[PDB]
Amino acid sequence: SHSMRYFDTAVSRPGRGEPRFISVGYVDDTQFVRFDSDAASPRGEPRAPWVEQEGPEYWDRETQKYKRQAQADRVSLRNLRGYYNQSEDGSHTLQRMSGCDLGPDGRLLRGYDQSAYDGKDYIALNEDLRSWTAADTAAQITQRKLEAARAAEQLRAYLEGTCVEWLRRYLENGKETLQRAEPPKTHVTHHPLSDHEATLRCWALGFYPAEITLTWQRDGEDQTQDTELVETRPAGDGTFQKWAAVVVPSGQEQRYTCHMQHEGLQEPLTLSWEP
């Protein structure tokens, strides 16, 4: 399910300068662009090779939109800092996710534009793409300010045209890396903790994209309660790693299987500890 997402973060440093704006753009789980306002001469830079090609107008313009967005966020913080009568001396965070899910027919599936203040849902754009939702009274104040401006009109035109159109172009320009599926490489391990039990840990390595389901099963029955399951982590080279682990009483290792679902595999993989 192909996707482009931009992840903005504006943090106030009240007694040390203007707030810092940082933005990163992803196509699926592959980063392609950044903007850091603490960079020496701040500009939007390429972070993947399938967008390094883009001309000067492209990069000058993105930079131009980024600098103007950083000004609105500083302002947005300044305002919201007011709307909870918060001291002008604690640091505060505004976060935003904007982007596109693509469809089967190269069409729009779902557009996003959501925010959060101090790590918490503040205001979001609804599925229809012309109405908002707030979390408290303070985000009602914004909802009027955004309906007045007709923001949901100009975002709908963005994420129904530009985002889908330019996503399709990125997918085609970086086809060699963006539209391969590299399914997981797997093994299971056995570490004794005592005379009477052992951790069984199922490993998935070298996979892309990051969406993966690992589960342990005792005689068909999922062990959702007992399964320690680390967050998926990048390998550093474009691929991902994850494991799932379950403490089993020794003697019963053969009743356990590990089940694995990933885009790169057409069938579920079933895996066991063979001594």
């Binding site: 931009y6 939109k65 534009d113 503040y122 914004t142 300010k145 401006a149 923001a151």
Partner: peptide, 9 residues
């Protein structure tokens, strides 16, 4: 390509 400019919150 990034979102277009919208009024502050």
């Amino acid at each position: 390509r990034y979102r277009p400019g919208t009024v502050a919150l």
